[PDB]
């Protein structure tokens, strides 16, 4: 029941088992990371820590490696010796990549052009329980050099994919996860970004540092003709 | 021939037959509303006023209730005793929801994530003559709390759906209707918004108060290499 | 090998063979234009100049007329007496319009609502090697009057199509070409626009005047948690 946890999710590299307990205490949900947070040479060690140092599987997701990679095959073998049931799929690009992870629950991380183009098909796949987007791999794989303008605001193609993922998730009753704020010390920018995300109906802001969790939890709390939806807005604020 | 009427369309709750004549005098097209403008307990009375107090069916659309609801079934029964041929479908989410309203003409009001994801299929359905988007139900159904930033500008997912509906409508030769400006006294904001909508090729700005109609009509009137399209822009301004 | 040429592409009307040599010297790739750059009465003469005054076919694309037009049929006849292998298809609106140009390579120019709605299908068609978008025909065909706000920034539906084309191109490994800056003397605006385009991974900025080429080439050269994609950003900047 991931929708019952709060909006602050925290990545934690899985080759750092000494930090698992602190990550769990700081965040609503921990994403133990076998992908880009762990160096290729450290991924075997991270798979052992995954088995050796368990966290609450009701509050923990495992980010595996991308479809078709040898690393993902090793990840799923390691996961068999765990109680984790929900995985995050990076570079998610087709419904078939989600379906081959059945019977696990899948959070699809769309961070390439093909995943954006196919977001609705990815969201609709039966194992999907959530959609995330990743600004940095998105820009990297498009061939660009930055996800943000000088003032920290997302560039337009990033805004486009962000909206795409929010709509695709909501169309199929999935959780919607907003992209990470890489500038850890930029609390002001994270504050505005998470408030923006909460305002349009994102369920989660994913973080890469535990200091970001209090900012996210606070942002997801609120500070002319009135129709029925505007009353729903007011009710959403109270909840 | 709704494309021949001006750009100022006005919602009027159908349980207010005393206001029908004033709505018709104020607006280019009246949308008699059986959905969110009328309280659930008042919808039977509104269906009687629909039959009892007719407006010009060439300049009047009836907003019915959403597909699958008992209310929509009662609405279509009431409409059989009228000369209205065009209905507005709220929470429009599939081509099938449009097709089941044949042989009526349908303006699909997309105001949910699923309708945005399926906008092209909805626009392409044979009964469709127009696409509208609804910012407030959109944000409400996504789980968010406001469609606009502090300065009154739409949030990004709203801008995304607005463009989606304009493109889907135009791709299939349909009318494009822009969302309502709920802040009635915010004439400055409506002025900018309707000018923006007219500039990109929206056909209609829908209003919720008759004072908004003169602002919309005025906004839809106009105040380096030149290629063939730039001359079309100039010709569009003159027309 | 169009990806090996630089980012500065230049339209040159094909009824101006006296300017072909200067266009080739100024630009990375020349788009010899049989469509909107040439008046209808001048198109036969332009087809003769196409045969009579050749440019390097490895650095030259021919913009033909739109699918289904008598002009496109005459264009393809003229092209048979040339060594050009790559054409640009204006008002590109379906995969079928691309496929009927086989065995030529095709740069699809999306500049209508239907082409935006079908961009992924157009990009995926086997002859496609590139996607471009055209702001001015886009707004013209939507029924609007300007692609840009007062400050020169694109209106939202233009930003939407721009992102659509970048994502559709990148999803299928195609070149991504950004729209032309019609205000030739607005060097500052072109500078910002091409920098923006290069930053998100556009491959080409198309120009309509040779003075714009140096601005584009310079713009496509570059002036907190670090993950693998941010290192790819840094590597992209160095390249
Ligand atoms: Mg990533
Ligand atoms: Mg509504
Ligand atoms: Mg054009």
DSSP secondary structure of chain A: -GGGS-SEEEEEETT-GGGHHHHHHH-SEEEEESSTTS-GGGHHHHHHHHHHS---GGGEEEE-PPTT-HHHHHHHHHHHTS---EEEETT---HHHHHTTTTSEEEEEE-SHHHHHTHHHHHHSTTEEEEEE-HHHHHHHHT-S-SB-TTSPBPHHHHHHHHHHHHHHHHTT-EEEEPP---TT-HHHHHHHHHHHHHHT--EEEESSTTHHHHHHHHTS------HHHHHHHHHHH-
User: What are the residues whose beta carbons fall under 8 Å from the beta carbon of C66, sequence distance 6 or more?
Assistant: C35, C72, C89, C90, C91
Give me the CATH number covering residue A197: 3.20.20.60
Neighbours of C80 (CB within 10 A): 8
Are C202 and C177 in contact by the 8 Å Cβ rule? The answer is yes
Chain B contact for A211 (CB, 8 A cutoff): no
Task: Name the helix (H) or strand (E) containing B188.
Answer: helix B187-200
The count of other CB atoms within 10 Å of the CB of residue B238 is 7
| Number of domains observed in the structure of chain B | 1
Rounded Cα distance between B170 and B172, Å, is: 5
CB pairs under 8 A between B and C: 105
Do C36 and B229 make contact, defined as CB atoms within 8 angstroms? yes
Helical H segments across C58-148, by residue range: 70-80, 95-99, 113-117, 119-124, 135-142
Q: Do B198 and C145 touch (CB under 8 A)?
A: yes
**Resolution expressed in Å:** 1.7
Using alpha carbons, select from C230, C159, C164 the residue that is nearest to residue C193. C159
Contact between residue A127 and residue A103 where contact means Cβ atoms under 8 Å apart: yes
Q: Is B13:B36 a contact under the CB 8 Å cutoff?
A: no
Spatial contact of A138 and A91, defined as CB atoms under 8 Å apart: no
Cβ of A233 within 8 Å of Cβ of B161? The answer is no
| Three-state secondary structure call for residue C157 | helix
Nearest to C113 among B160, B170, B233 (CB): B170
The β-bridge relationship of strands B8-13 and B29-33 is: parallel
Q: Are B193 and B181 in contact (CB under 8 A)?
A: yes
C168 membership: H or E segment, kind and range: helix C156-171
Residue C63's closest CA among C39, C37, C31? C31
Q: State whether A229 and B155 contact (CB < 8 Å).
A: no
Q: How many angstroms separate the CA atoms of B181 and A14, rounded?
A: 49
How many Cα atoms occupy the beta-carbon half-sphere of C217 within 13 Å? 14
Contact partners, residue C42, CB within 8 Å, separation at least 6? C15
C137 annotated as ligand-binding? yes
Question: How far apart, in whole angstroms, are the C-alpha atoms of residue B104 and residue B72?
Answer: 14
Q: Which domain holds residue B180?
A: 2-238
Q: Which of B145, B156, B183 lies at the smallest CB-CB distance from A236?
A: B145
Residue of C nearest to B234 (CA): C145
Q: Is C41 helix (H, G, I), strand (E, B) or coil?
A: helix
Is B136 annotated to bind a ligand? Reply is no
Q: Which residues of B touch C117 (CB under 8 A)?
A: 120, 167-168, 171
């Amino acid at each position: 029941n991931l929708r019952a946890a709060g909006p602050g999710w925290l990545f934690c590299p899985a080759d750092r088992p000494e930090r698992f307990a602190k990550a769990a205490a700081a965040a609503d949900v921990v994403i133990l990371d076998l992908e880009d947070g762990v160096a290729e040479a450290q991924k075997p060690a991270a798979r052992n820590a995954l088995r050796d140092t368990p966290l609450d599987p009701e509050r923990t997701v495992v980010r595996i490696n991308a479809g078709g990679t040898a690393d993902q095959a090793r990840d799923l073998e390691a996961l068999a010796g765990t109680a984790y049931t929900t995985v995050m799929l990076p570079k998610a690009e087709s419904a078939a990549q989600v379906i081959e992870l059945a019977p696990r629950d899948v959070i699809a991380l769309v961070e390439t052009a093909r995943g954006a183009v196919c977001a609705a098909e990815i969201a609709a796949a039966d194992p999907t329980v959530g959609m995330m987007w990743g600004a940095e791999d998105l820009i990297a794989t498009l061939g660009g050099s930055s996800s943000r303008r000088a003032d920290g605001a997302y560039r337009d193609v990033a805004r486009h994919v962000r909206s795409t993922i929010l709509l695709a998730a909501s169309a199929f009753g999935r959780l919607a996860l907003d992209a990470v704020h890489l500038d850890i010390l930029d609390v002001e920018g994270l504050q505005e970004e998470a408030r923006d995300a909460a305002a349009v109906g994102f369920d989660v802001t994913v973080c890469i540092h535990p200091s970001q969790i209090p900012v996210v939890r606070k942002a997801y709390r609120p500070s002319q003709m009135v129709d029925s939806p505007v009353l729903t807005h007011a009710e959403t604020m109270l909840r």
